[PDB]
């Protein structure tokens, strides 16, 4: 229960980012959550050809059209069980490049987030000269990892939220946080 | 003519303003934001008469409401700037402040005020006292935000380094090289009428906040936050006025051979990500001609590859390319 206004951000907004919407949730924080992709990708029958959809689309129209697909196939993987979470935390996918939102934290999953992150804020001049700490979390894009994934980012928000002055505190933190982890989290700052 | 929506909203606010003599922080910061929504907005007409009633609660006990005044504050300067002499008493006031939060906000606020406060009295004809004292008090902000390079606070560096960044770019001439931006305002579009200022001390003022950003940057000790924020600052300064294009590819060149001790290994990283960043936003201005194989080499030392950087470079016909080459030729 900390007034942090924080953002987790990957590709689609599908698997990692709402797996740490969900915890952050539940945890009292104001969370908001974004893909960086051109269109949200899900896993599909094989390697390549998988299931795109528009930033937009509810998870409700993407469960009824992996549903009416293959209902069995999707429920053994387990994505009609993270459709149905999704629908519960929020109405559709959102992209990070059209936001208006502000935030005081950004975590990325992955390098590559992080780089289409770090690119739009850059590509937009600065109006409120309102700084914003972009870390890189990074959670490799699978159920099961998403979910650890989820756990490490919610232990990092909370520890950040315990700190009376992040912005002092923010770069010993992190590196104290990187030891006791064993983790590599990237770390800037952008302009609103 | 005539209607009852003024009368109405006159009502509204009135009402509002006797509840805060009264009224908790939690419910001072609600209703502030009402009065601002109406005041400053739906019925603007009523911002003069309703200022002190806004400007006393600068002095109130709790932050929160503290950063709700430089929010009004700066909407003022943005909506009705001819009130700017009556309300940046309070923004230098505030940049005395305590609280580091509070501090902070009105940094970021000052980027916006000092635009607008610049604009508003170069376009004025016959300038009172009131536009002296403004400028006074304008005159003093910088120097305030300046010391705070030096603040103890973090946080309280970053946004300084940022604001500074604004008064480089306004206190500098715009030329063809300089990158296309709506709102772009240069010492260009100082008028010679203007007896508040003279354009060449504001210019040697830039110059000297240049020269300041260029050896803060340089230092052995500085943090990662602001070195990543002192060079996005050099970098947005050298792409809207590729005059100081030189300066900012040798603090560049500086910092990648020399990367400060104090720096963690995700540190550096972070840091080397950022300036390859800068460096590409660099390359791709026709100011940055003169620069391009110490810029190339940079980047070939950060990881891009040949065809990554040569995508980068605009395409320059020959005439335009051999008066470039002749006027560097000339400048030696």
Same mark, same amino acid.
């Given at each position: 229960? /900390?007034?942090?206004?924080?953002?987790?951000?990957?590709?689609?907004?599908?698997?990692?980012?709402?797996?740490?919407?969900?915890?952050?949730?539940?945890?009292?924080?104001?969370?908001?959550?974004?893909?960086?992709?051109?269109?949200?990708?899900?896993?599909?029958?094989?390697?390549?050809?998988?299931?795109?959809?528009? &930033?937009?689309?509810?998870?409700?129209?993407?469960?009824?059209?992996?549903?009416?697909?293959?209902?069995?196939?999707?429920?053994?993987? +387990?994505?009609?069980?993270?459709?149905?979470?999704?629908?519960?935390?929020?109405?559709?996918?959102?992209?990070?490049?059209?936001?208006?939102?502000?935030?005081?934290?950004?975590?990325?999953?992955?390098?590559?987030?992080?780089?289409?992150?770090?690119?739009?804020?850059?590509?937009?001049?600065? !109006?409120?000269?309102?700084?914003?700490?972009?870390?890189?979390?990074?959670?490799?894009?699978?159920?099961?990892?998403?979910?650890?994934?989820?756990?490490?980012?919610?232990?990092?928000?909370?520890?950040?939220?315990? /700190?009376?002055?992040?912005?002092?505190?923010?770069?010993?933190?992190?590196?104290?946080?990187?030891?006791?982890?064993?983790?590599?989290?990237?770390?800037?700052?952008?302009?609103? | 003519?005539?209607?009852?929506?003024? $009368?109405?909203?006159?009502?509204?606010?009135?009402?509002?303003?006797?509840?805060?003599?009264?009224?908790?922080?939690?419910?001072?910061?609600?209703?502030?934001?009402?009065?601002?929504?109406?005041?400053?907005?739906?019925?603007?007409? *009523?911002?003069?008469?309703?200022?002190?009633?806004?400007?006393?609660?600068?002095?109130?006990?709790?932050?929160?409401?503290?950063?709700?005044?430089?929010?009004? !504050?700066?909407?003022?300067?943005?909506?009705?700037?001819?009130?700017?002499?009556?309300?940046?008493?309070?923004?230098?006031?505030?940049?005395?402040?305590?609280?580091?939060?509070?501090?902070?906000?009105?940094?970021? $606020?000052?980027?916006?005020?000092?635009?607008? +406060?610049?604009?508003?009295?170069?376009?004025?004809?016959?300038?009172?006292?009131?536009?002296?004292?403004?400028?006074?008090?304008?005159?003093?902000?910088? $120097?305030?935000?300046?010391?705070?390079?030096?603040?103890?606070?973090?946080?309280?560096?970053?946004?300084?380094?940022? &604001?500074?960044?604004?008064?480089?770019?306004?206190?500098?001439?715009?030329?063809?090289?300089?990158?296309?931006?709506?709102?772009?305002?240069?010492?260009?579009?100082?008028?010679?009428?203007?007896? *508040?200022?003279?354009?060449?001390?504001?210019?040697?003022?830039?110059?000297?906040?240049?020269?300041?950003?260029?050896?803060?940057?340089?230092?052995?000790?500085?943090?990662?936050?602001?070195?990543?924020?002192?060079?996005?600052?050099?970098?947005?300064?050298?792409?809207?006025?590729?005059?100081?294009? +030189?300066?900012?590819?040798?603090?560049?060149?500086?910092?990648?051979?020399?990367?400060?001790?104090?720096?963690?290994?995700?540190?550096?990283? /972070?840091?080397?990500?950022?300036?390859?960043?800068?460096?590409?936003?660099?390359?791709?201005?026709?100011?940055?001609?003169?620069?391009?194989?110490?810029?190339?080499?940079?980047?070939?030392?950060?990881?891009?590859?040949?065809?990554?950087?040569?995508?980068?470079?605009?395409?320059?016909?020959?005439?335009?390319? $051999?008066?470039?080459?002749?006027?560097?030729?000339?400048?030696?």
């Amino acid at each position: 229960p /900390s007034k942090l206004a924080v953002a987790v951000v990957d590709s689609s907004n599908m698997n990692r980012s709402m797996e740490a919407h969900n915890f952050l949730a539940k945890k009292g924080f104001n969370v908001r959550s974004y893909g960086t992709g051109e269109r949200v990708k899900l896993p599909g029958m094989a390697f390549d050809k998988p299931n795109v959809y528009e &930033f937009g689309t509810k998870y409700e129209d993407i469960y009824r059209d992996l549903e009416s697909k293959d209902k069995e196939f999707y429920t053994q993987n +387990g994505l009609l069980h993270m459709l149905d979470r999704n629908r519960r935390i929020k109405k559709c996918p959102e992209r990070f490049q059209d936001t208006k939102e502000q935030f005081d934290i950004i975590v990325t999953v992955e390098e590559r987030v992080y780089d289409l992150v770090v690119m739009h804020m850059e590509s937009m001049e600065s !109006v409120d000269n309102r700084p914003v700490h972009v870390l890189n979390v990074d959670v490799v894009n699978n159920a099961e990892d998403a979910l650890m994934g989820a756990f490490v980012i919610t232990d990092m928000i909370n520890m950040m939220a315990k /700190s009376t002055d992040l912005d002092n505190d923010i770069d010993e933190l992190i590196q104290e946080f990187e030891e006791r982890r064993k983790r590599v989290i990237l770390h800037s700052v952008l302009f609103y | 003519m005539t209607d009852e929506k003024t $009368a109405t909203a006159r009502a509204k606010v009135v009402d509002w303003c006797n509840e805060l003599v009264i009224a908790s922080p939690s419910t001072k910061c609600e209703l502030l934001a009402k009065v601002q929504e109406t005041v400053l907005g739906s019925c603007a007409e *009523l911002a003069e008469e309703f200022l002190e009633s806004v400007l006393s609660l600068a002095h109130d006990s709790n932050m929160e409401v503290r950063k709700q005044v430089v929010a009004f !504050v700066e909407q003022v300067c943005k909506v009705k700037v001819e009130l700017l002499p009556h309300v940046i008493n309070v923004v230098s006031m505030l940049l005395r402040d305590n609280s580091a939060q509070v501090i902070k906000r009105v940094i970021q $606020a000052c980027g916006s005020i000092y635009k607008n +406060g610049l604009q508003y009295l170069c376009s004025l004809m016959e300038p009172g006292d009131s536009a002296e004292q403004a400028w006074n008090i304008l005159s003093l902000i910088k $120097a305030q935000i300046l010391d705070m390079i030096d603040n103890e606070n973090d946080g309280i560096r970053t946004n300084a380094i940022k &604001f500074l960044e604004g008064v480089v770019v306004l206190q500098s001439f715009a030329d063809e090289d300089s990158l296309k931006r709506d709102g772009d305002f240069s010492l260009a579009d100082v008028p010679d009428h203007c007896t *508040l200022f003279r354009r060449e001390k504001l210019q040697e003022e830039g110059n000297n906040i240049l020269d300041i950003l260029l050896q803060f940057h340089g230092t052995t000790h500085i943090s990662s936050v602001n070195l990543i924020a002192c060079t996005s600052s050099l970098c947005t300064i050298a792409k809207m006025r590729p005059i100081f294009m +030189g300066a900012v590819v040798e603090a560049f060149k500086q910092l990648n051979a020399n990367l400060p001790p104090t720096l963690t290994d995700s540190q550096v990283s /972070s840091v080397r990500k950022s300036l390859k960043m800068q460096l590409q936003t660099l390359l791709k201005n026709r100011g940055a001609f003169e620069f391009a194989s110490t810029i190339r080499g940079m980047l070939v030392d950060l990881g891009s590859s040949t065809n990554e950087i040569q995508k980068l470079i605009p395409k320059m016909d020959k005439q335009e390319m $051999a008066r470039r080459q002749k006027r560097i030729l000339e400048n030696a």
